[PDB]
Design a protein around this motif. Structure first.
Motif, PDB file in Angstrom:
ATOM      1  N   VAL A   1     -35.703 -92.325  -7.960  1.00  0.00           N
ATOM      2  CA  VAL A   1     -35.782 -91.514  -9.167  1.00  0.00           C
ATOM      3  C   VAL A   1     -37.179 -91.605  -9.764  1.00  0.00           C
ATOM      4  N   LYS A   2     -37.533 -90.621 -10.583  1.00  0.00           N
ATOM      5  CA  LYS A   2     -38.827 -90.565 -11.246  1.00  0.00           C
ATOM      6  C   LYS A   2     -38.657 -90.989 -12.697  1.00  0.00           C
ATOM      7  N   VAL A   3     -39.432 -91.993 -13.114  1.00  0.00           N
ATOM      8  CA  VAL A   3     -39.259 -92.572 -14.444  1.00  0.00           C
ATOM      9  C   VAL A   3     -39.508 -91.530 -15.526  1.00  0.00           C
ATOM     10  N   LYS A   4     -40.530 -90.697 -15.350  1.00  0.00           N
ATOM     11  CA  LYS A   4     -40.905 -89.716 -16.356  1.00  0.00           C
ATOM     12  C   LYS A   4     -41.335 -88.422 -15.683  1.00  0.00           C
ATOM     13  N   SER A   5     -40.772 -87.307 -16.142  1.00  0.00           N
ATOM     14  CA  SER A   5     -41.221 -85.993 -15.703  1.00  0.00           C
ATOM     15  C   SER A   5     -41.355 -85.103 -16.927  1.00  0.00           C
ATOM     16  N   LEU A   6     -42.487 -84.415 -17.049  1.00  0.00           N
ATOM     17  CA  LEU A   6     -42.807 -83.661 -18.251  1.00  0.00           C
ATOM     18  C   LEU A   6     -43.083 -82.199 -17.936  1.00  0.00           C
ATOM     19  N   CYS A   7     -42.884 -81.365 -18.953  1.00  0.00           N
ATOM     20  CA  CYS A   7     -43.347 -79.983 -18.944  1.00  0.00           C
ATOM     21  C   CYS A   7     -43.838 -79.656 -20.344  1.00  0.00           C
ATOM     22  N   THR A   8     -45.078 -79.182 -20.449  1.00  0.00           N
ATOM     23  CA  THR A   8     -45.729 -78.951 -21.732  1.00  0.00           C
ATOM     24  C   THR A   8     -46.060 -77.473 -21.889  1.00  0.00           C
ATOM     25  N   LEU A   9     -45.780 -76.932 -23.071  1.00  0.00           N
ATOM     26  CA  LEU A   9     -46.029 -75.535 -23.397  1.00  0.00           C
ATOM     27  C   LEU A   9     -46.847 -75.452 -24.677  1.00  0.00           C
ATOM     28  N   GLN A  10     -47.749 -74.477 -24.737  1.00  0.00           N
ATOM     29  CA  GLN A  10     -48.596 -74.278 -25.906  1.00  0.00           C
ATOM     30  C   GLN A  10     -47.995 -73.205 -26.804  1.00  0.00           C
ATOM     31  N   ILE A  11     -47.825 -73.531 -28.077  1.00  0.00           N
ATOM     32  CA  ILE A  11     -47.205 -72.640 -29.054  1.00  0.00           C
ATOM     33  C   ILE A  11     -48.303 -71.841 -29.745  1.00  0.00           C
ATOM     34  N   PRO A  12     -48.215 -70.509 -29.779  1.00  0.00           N
ATOM     35  CA  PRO A  12     -49.217 -69.717 -30.507  1.00  0.00           C
ATOM     36  C   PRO A  12     -49.215 -69.998 -32.002  1.00  0.00           C
ATOM     37  N   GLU A  13     -50.155 -69.390 -32.730  1.00  0.00           N
ATOM     38  CA  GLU A  13     -50.319 -69.713 -34.143  1.00  0.00           C
ATOM     39  C   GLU A  13     -49.211 -69.106 -34.996  1.00  0.00           C
ATOM     40  N   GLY A  14     -48.780 -67.887 -34.668  1.00  0.00           N
ATOM     41  CA  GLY A  14     -47.779 -67.223 -35.488  1.00  0.00           C
ATOM     42  C   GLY A  14     -46.409 -67.871 -35.413  1.00  0.00           C
ATOM     43  N   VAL A  15     -46.020 -68.333 -34.232  1.00  0.00           N
ATOM     44  CA  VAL A  15     -44.654 -68.768 -33.961  1.00  0.00           C
ATOM     45  C   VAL A  15     -44.513 -70.254 -34.261  1.00  0.00           C
ATOM     46  N   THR A  16     -43.331 -70.647 -34.741  1.00  0.00           N
ATOM     47  CA  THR A  16     -42.975 -72.043 -34.953  1.00  0.00           C
ATOM     48  C   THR A  16     -41.702 -72.348 -34.177  1.00  0.00           C
ATOM     49  N   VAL A  17     -41.731 -73.423 -33.394  1.00  0.00           N
ATOM     50  CA  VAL A  17     -40.594 -73.859 -32.589  1.00  0.00           C
ATOM     51  C   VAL A  17     -39.985 -75.087 -33.249  1.00  0.00           C
ATOM     52  N   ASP A  18     -38.658 -75.098 -33.372  1.00  0.00           N
ATOM     53  CA  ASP A  18     -37.938 -76.211 -33.974  1.00  0.00           C
ATOM     54  C   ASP A  18     -36.793 -76.611 -33.057  1.00  0.00           C
ATOM     55  N   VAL A  19     -36.691 -77.904 -32.759  1.00  0.00           N
ATOM     56  CA  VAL A  19     -35.668 -78.426 -31.862  1.00  0.00           C
ATOM     57  C   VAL A  19     -34.861 -79.480 -32.603  1.00  0.00           C
ATOM     58  N   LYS A  20     -33.537 -79.403 -32.484  1.00  0.00           N
ATOM     59  CA  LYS A  20     -32.646 -80.375 -33.109  1.00  0.00           C
ATOM     60  C   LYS A  20     -31.377 -80.445 -32.271  1.00  0.00           C
ATOM     61  N   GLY A  21     -31.184 -81.561 -31.576  1.00  0.00           N
ATOM     62  CA  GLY A  21     -30.005 -81.723 -30.741  1.00  0.00           C
ATOM     63  C   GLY A  21     -29.951 -80.769 -29.569  1.00  0.00           C
ATOM     64  N   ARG A  22     -31.090 -80.543 -28.911  1.00  0.00           N
ATOM     65  CA  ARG A  22     -31.194 -79.636 -27.766  1.00  0.00           C
ATOM     66  C   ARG A  22     -30.824 -78.203 -28.139  1.00  0.00           C
ATOM     67  N   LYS A  23     -31.069 -77.828 -29.392  1.00  0.00           N
ATOM     68  CA  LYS A  23     -30.861 -76.467 -29.884  1.00  0.00           C
ATOM     69  C   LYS A  23     -32.213 -75.946 -30.359  1.00  0.00           C
ATOM     70  N   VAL A  24     -32.795 -75.020 -29.607  1.00  0.00           N
ATOM     71  CA  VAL A  24     -34.143 -74.539 -29.885  1.00  0.00           C
ATOM     72  C   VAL A  24     -34.057 -73.298 -30.761  1.00  0.00           C
ATOM     73  N   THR A  25     -34.931 -73.215 -31.761  1.00  0.00           N
ATOM     74  CA  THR A  25     -35.060 -72.020 -32.584  1.00  0.00           C
ATOM     75  C   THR A  25     -36.537 -71.699 -32.751  1.00  0.00           C
ATOM     76  N   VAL A  26     -36.929 -70.508 -32.314  1.00  0.00           N
ATOM     77  CA  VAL A  26     -38.301 -70.033 -32.422  1.00  0.00           C
ATOM     78  C   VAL A  26     -38.344 -68.948 -33.485  1.00  0.00           C
ATOM     79  N   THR A  27     -39.119 -69.185 -34.540  1.00  0.00           N
ATOM     80  CA  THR A  27     -39.231 -68.261 -35.658  1.00  0.00           C
ATOM     81  C   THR A  27     -40.681 -67.833 -35.814  1.00  0.00           C
ATOM     82  N   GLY A  28     -40.907 -66.527 -35.831  1.00  0.00           N
ATOM     83  CA  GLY A  28     -42.225 -65.988 -36.086  1.00  0.00           C
ATOM     84  C   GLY A  28     -42.111 -64.628 -36.731  1.00  0.00           C
ATOM     85  N   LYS A  29     -43.154 -63.814 -36.617  1.00  0.00           N
ATOM     86  CA  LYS A  29     -43.024 -62.425 -37.020  1.00  0.00           C
ATOM     87  C   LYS A  29     -42.028 -61.720 -36.107  1.00  0.00           C
ATOM     88  N   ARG A  30     -41.536 -60.573 -36.575  1.00  0.00           N
ATOM     89  CA  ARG A  30     -40.735 -59.660 -35.766  1.00  0.00           C
ATOM     90  C   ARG A  30     -39.319 -60.182 -35.518  1.00  0.00           C
TER      91      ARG A  30
END
Ligand code: K
Ligand code: MG
Ligand code: MG
Length: 186
Positions: free
Chosen positions: A1-30
């Motif tokens: 097994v692999k102790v650590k595996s990552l994936c990283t994403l860059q969030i633009p300026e307008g949008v805000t990402v919020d995670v709570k209990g594996r429930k993602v919510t992305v709020t921005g314009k539109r």
RNA sequence: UGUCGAACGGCAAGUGCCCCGAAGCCAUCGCACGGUGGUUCUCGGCUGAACGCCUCUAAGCCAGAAGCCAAUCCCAAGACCAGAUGCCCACU
């Protein structure tokens, strides 16, 4: 097994990402999008100062690791939909019988597909907007618009799948409703 | 045909026989009626990694068989209903 595996994403300026209990919510314009990923069991972190979204798997095999990129792609799709939206253009292609498509409010009615007398009716959810392009610009084109990619598609597919040629050659009789261009609205 | 003497009334022939016959029963020989949602197969798709690409899948999804499950229908509390009620009586 692999102790650590990552994936990283860059969030633009307008949008805000919020995670709570594996429930993602992305709020921005539109608009605002929400995804439930409680079936995945990953470690989701958001660095607001650095505008990064990280998804981590601890002590994972290939099957659990395969979900990191899927989660990253889902969050990227929600960011893209919240920022610029999604637009699917489908076209009615026919050889002999014109395919008459009438679009009411959230309602699509397809008539004269291969000369059939049966009327095909599709109800579109309020989160996806369906319009018909006037024939002067492009003939028999229907446009689906929405923030959710998984919701803009599926609609374009339930429209393709309802007009399927039956009991005939499909090399011949190529008529149907086909998605031609997938793009954004902003 | 026999028989009460004839007629009338009948009667015997294990319903003498023939015709018509109500009521009842009965004939695809007549007439009436015979419903609705799901979950899924097969399949085809969506979004999407693994595997910078790809891909219906792998995590998710969407559609979807006369199968299957419920509704409707028939029996129904040994399914022991502390369901509800009407009268007495007991208790009070
Ligand atoms: K008769
Ligand atoms: Mg007699
Ligand atoms: Mg005698």
């Amino acid at each position: 097994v692999k102790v650590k595996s990552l994936c990283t994403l860059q969030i633009p300026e307008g949008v805000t990402v919020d995670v709570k209990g594996r429930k993602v919510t992305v709020t921005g314009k539109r608009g605002t999008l929400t995804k439930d990923l409680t079936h995945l069991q990953l470690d989701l972190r958001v660095d607001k100062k650095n505008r990064t979204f990280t998804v981590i798997r601890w002590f994972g095999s290939k099957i659990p690791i395969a979900c990191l990129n899927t989660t990253k792609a889902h969050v990227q799709n929600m960011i893209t939909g919240v920022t610029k939206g999604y637009r699917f253009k489908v076209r009615c292609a026919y050889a002999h019988f014109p395919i008459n498509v009438s679009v009411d409010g959230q309602n699509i009615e397809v008539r004269n597909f291969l000369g059939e007398k049966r009327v095909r009716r599709q109800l579109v959810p309020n989160t996806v907007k369906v319009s018909q392009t006037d024939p002067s610009k492009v003939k028999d084109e229907i446009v689906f618009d929405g923030n959710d990619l998984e919701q803009v598609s599926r609609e374009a597919a339930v429209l393709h799948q309802m007009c399927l040629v039956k009991k005939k050659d499909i090399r011949k009789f190529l008529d149907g409703i086909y998605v031609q261009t997938k793009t954004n609205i902003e």
